[PDB]
Structure formats: C-alpha cells, structure tokens
Chains A and B, each alone.
Chain A
C-alpha cells in the first residue's frame, strides 16, 4: 500500500535487501522482501520449502549412505562428514574431558585477530531491546547453519559458505524470525530445530537426517560452552558474510547488530537455559516429524501427497528389493 515492512534485527531495516537482488543476492528467497509481513513470510517459506525439497535426491542420499559401495561412498562424502568435528566443538570437547566439573561455563580468551574484529567490524552502541526472545532463537538457528557448514566443508570455508549458511537459516534467506505461523502446538525452539532439519534436507549438497541431527548435537555443545564460545562462532559467521561482496548485506541488516548486541546484552543464564531447552526438543524428535508435501499429478492440477522422511526410506528399500530380486 505504502510503507515497507521492516525486517532484520529488531525489525529496524528496509530497502537494503530489495536492492541487493539486482546485485546478485540469490540467498534471499522472498518474492517481495519490502512488502511482506512476519506471518506471510512463514506462509511463503513453508510453501517454498515444499517445492524445493526433492525426495528422489533425498532417497539417493539415504540409499548411498546405507547401501552404496566403497567407491560411491567416497565420491559422496557422507561417512567422512559424520566423523568430523569442527574446530570450535573440538575445543569444547577438550575442555569437557579435562574438566572435573563438566557443568560450568568454558573460559575463553579471544585471540588477537578476534579482538581486532570486535573493535573494527561491529557497531559500537547501546541496545534497548525489549523483545529479546526472537534474538536468541535466531542465534539458535544461525549456529545450526554454521555448524552444518563446518561439517559439510570439513573445517575450511569455501566461496559458497555464506550461501550454505544463509540457506539453512530461515532468518536470513526468508528474513523470518517468527518461524511459527499464527492463524485465525509445539515450542518455538522445537520449530527452529525442525526448520533447521527440513532446510538441511532440501537445500545443501548433503541431505541426510543423521547429518542434520549431528549438526544440532554440536549446537547444544557450543551453547553449553557458554556466551563466550557462542561469541567465537558468531565472529566466524560474521566474517564469512562481511568478506563476501554480495552477501555482506546480511551483516548489515542482521548479523552486524546481532553479534554486537549479544556481546553486551547476552545473558549467560539465558544461553545455558536455551541449551537445555533445545536438547530436550531435539531428543523428543524423530524421522516421524519431518514431513514434506511432495508432488503426484492429476488430470480431470498437481496433487500433493504428504509423507514423512521415514516413509520415503521404506518405499525406497521396498522397491530396492524388486531391483535386487527380479534381475
């Protein structure tokens, strides 16, 4: 009608994204970034995740992990990926083993390069934020993106690292902080975790439920490490976006502020609490909750059939027998 619908950190930003699409921003997935409210963003995302998800790609990836040979498995990568531990997780795990009280926060001394980042690259300002609960959940979401990226890439960033992270993160590719629809069941943290999984089975190179789950376990570990370990990850995420001459924009509208805010207003108790909260939700989940609407046709328009990811593996393994049998 008139006014743009603000987005990003505390809904302060506009225009920036819209402009970036003319400049090669292919992370954004909103059809109309400047004129789409929070609820409509959900509607739009959920529907687009369905069109994006590819079951034939999903089953291929599963079958390879379970039934492919030594050769096909090494081309794919999945077995190695699942053995891998990101540098940040690894220094938490190391603290854990040595510590006689695994329940405390983990002491971090920020590196010289990290001190420099915090002076130079982040906004210096106070943050009056009344509504901080969507900011923590964004942290929860973005960490999953990061951890997934570290695993899939085995510790070394690449020229699509920001794209991978931005895709797995609903607050970035869809500017969506609400996550849960409202119209006229489940925790918000439980949705964030389901969203992470569903996107990790539709967008990246490796689409694998175990992987998604592994990435989430590692998120819980970093959280348990405490605020200072979360900041260390936030700093890496931030750089990966800043260093990109197109996607730097997501620092502008979201990560610039989010990391600066977190450094000063970030609570240690809220972090730990989020950690134990998200672990419960993750552990209450199974393949049965991961549903996608997939396509079968109809002529008398396309008709969607709903099936969870476990149903897809049984139909695969069932038809796999007929192939192994008949010839």
Chain B
C-alpha cells in the first residue's frame, strides 16, 4: 500500500505518498491492519 498520513494541527489526517514529509515527520499507513476472525489475542490487547 502507498497511502500515508500525518495528523495536522487541527487533529485531522493529512495525506501524502511520502514515507517522511518535507518537515521530517515519519508517516503512517492510512489503512488498518488485517483482521483474522480467529484471534485469541483479544485478552492480551485489552489490558493495555
């Protein structure tokens, strides 16, 4: 996947293709992680 973002000052996503912006912020994938219906890690992920 190519779509990346950083949160602007207003709190909302700013989209970009670059892996790091012009101002030196490292960018996040725009898309959520895959989900596997059988995921017994619900208990580990919930405590944090």
The answer to whether A and B touch in the complex, with CB atoms under 8 Å apart, is no
Q: Could you list which residues of chain B lie within 8 angstroms of chain A, going by C-beta atoms?
A: none
Q: Could you list which residues of chain A lie within 8 angstroms of chain B, going by C-beta atoms?
A: none
